[PDB]
Amino acid sequence: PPSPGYYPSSQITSLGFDQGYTNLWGPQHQRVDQGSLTIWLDSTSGSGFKSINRYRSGYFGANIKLQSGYTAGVITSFYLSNNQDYPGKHDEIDIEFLGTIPGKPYTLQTNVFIEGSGDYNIIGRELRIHLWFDPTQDYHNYAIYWTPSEIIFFVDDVPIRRYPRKSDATFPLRPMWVYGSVWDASSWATKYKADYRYQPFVGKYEDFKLGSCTVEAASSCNPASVSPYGQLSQQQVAAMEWVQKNYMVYNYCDDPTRDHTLTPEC
Numbered sequence: 001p002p003s004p005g006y007y008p009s010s011q012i013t014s015l016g017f018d019q020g021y022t023n024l025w026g027p028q029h030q031r032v033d034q035g036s037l038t039i040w041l042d043s044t045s046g047s048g049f050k051s052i053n054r055y056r057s058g059y060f061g062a063n064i065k066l067q068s069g070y071t072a073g074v075i076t077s078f079y080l081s082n083n084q085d086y087p088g089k090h091d092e093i094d095i096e097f098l099g100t101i102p103g104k105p106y107t108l109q110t111n112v113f114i115e116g117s118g119d120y121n122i123i124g125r126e127l128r129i130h131l132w133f134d135p136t137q138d139y140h141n142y143a144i145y146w147t148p149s150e151i152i153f154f155v156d157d158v159p160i161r162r163y164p165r166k167s168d169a170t171f172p173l174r175p176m177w178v179y180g181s182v183w184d185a186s187s188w189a190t191k192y193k194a195d196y197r198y199q200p201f202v203g204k205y206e207d208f209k210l211g212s213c214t215v216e217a218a219s220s221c222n223p224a225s226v227s228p229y230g231q232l233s234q235q236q237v238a239a240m241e242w243v244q245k246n247y248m249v250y251n252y253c254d255d256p257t258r259d260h261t262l263t264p265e266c
Contacts, residue, residue: 001132002242005235007157008226009061009141014207017049021208024050024179029200035208040200041074041182048181055080058212059224060178061143061154064097065204066106068136071099073186073194076203078142080176089116091172093151095142097135098128099201101191105130107249108142110153110161114172123262127161128250129243139206145226148173152226159232159240163265170265175215180205 016035023030026047031038039047062078076097083090092113097106112125133140133156145152151163151172165171182203186193211224227233232240244251252258253266260266 001158002239003235004158004233004239006226006228006233008059008145008154008211008224009143009157009209012059012061012209012211012224014209017205017208019208020053020210021049021051021178024048036204036206038202038204039180039182040202041184042199042201043196046181046183048179048183051178053214054082054175054177055146056175056213056215056217057147057221057223058210059143059145059226060212061141061209062180062205063139063207064135064142065139065206066097066135067099067201067203069102070195070198071106071201072101072192073184073189074099074182074201075185076180076182076201078144078178078180078205080144080146080172080178082174082176084177086115086174088119091115091174091176093144093146093172093176095144095153098185098188099191104191106135108135108155108160109250112151112163112172114170118262121259121262124252124258125163125263125265126250126252127248129155129160129247130249131155132243132247139204141207143209145223146172146176147223152232154226155243158243159236160243162232162240166265170263 017037026045029047079094081092094111096109109128143154153161213221
């Protein structure tokens with residue numbers, strides 16, 4: 001996995017959970033230890049947190065460590081959304097770790113929604129990768145960079161996907177909050193579905209990173225730097241390309257099913 005030659009996360013000071021975030025649901029399944037967060041899911045409830053701010057723009061990261069063993073049907077997430085502002089008609093930019101059975105790898109799923117998931121059609125913009133490390137064995141850095149021109153997803157400072165702006169209809173242009181959660185995705189598990197005999201399924205988040213612009217920030221605020229000079233460098237592009245070439249397992253654009261008239265950016 002070659003150096004991208006620029007390490008955005010190393011330029012932003014970490015914050016403790018409570019400086020940027022608050023429990024949103026499952027408060028009983030959440031704990032904070034010196035700024036580090038543990039959340040978990042069992043048959044009674046999952047858990048999730050939200051930013052104290054809405055944002056117009058920024059870089060949003062966390063160190064995240066995933067549950068070991070049988071995790072089929074469980075999703076650990078870190079994402080931006082305004083579903084609470086525009087319920088059912090919302091924008092979202094996701095990092096989702098799809099749980100698995102022991103013996104097989106976690107899949108990192110990236111996704112983008114703009115003005116609603118489908119009501120008659122499943123309308124995803126998914127790009128899934130396998131990882132070149134074991135995400136359960138340590139904390140690794142995951143980030144979402146979102147501006148009015150582009151979304152970039154980073155894993156350990158390696159860009160894995162860039163979703164550029166091609167039309168207003170296909171790009172997120174409204175403010176968003178940040179969220180994370182652990183939850184039951186057995187409806188997609190059509191490996192398998194959630195088996196609660198392996199119960200708490202725990203998600204661990206630490207060293208939160210914010211290089212961002214609240215909705216109300218002074219107009220001079222711009223998102224943090226993610227490259228030398230303000231577009232991805234060719235070295236970063238090359239790292240991304242290697243990732244997609246060696247670890248990408250699904251790209252909605254390449255999927256010959258799926259109605260591309262409903263996602264015209266491909």
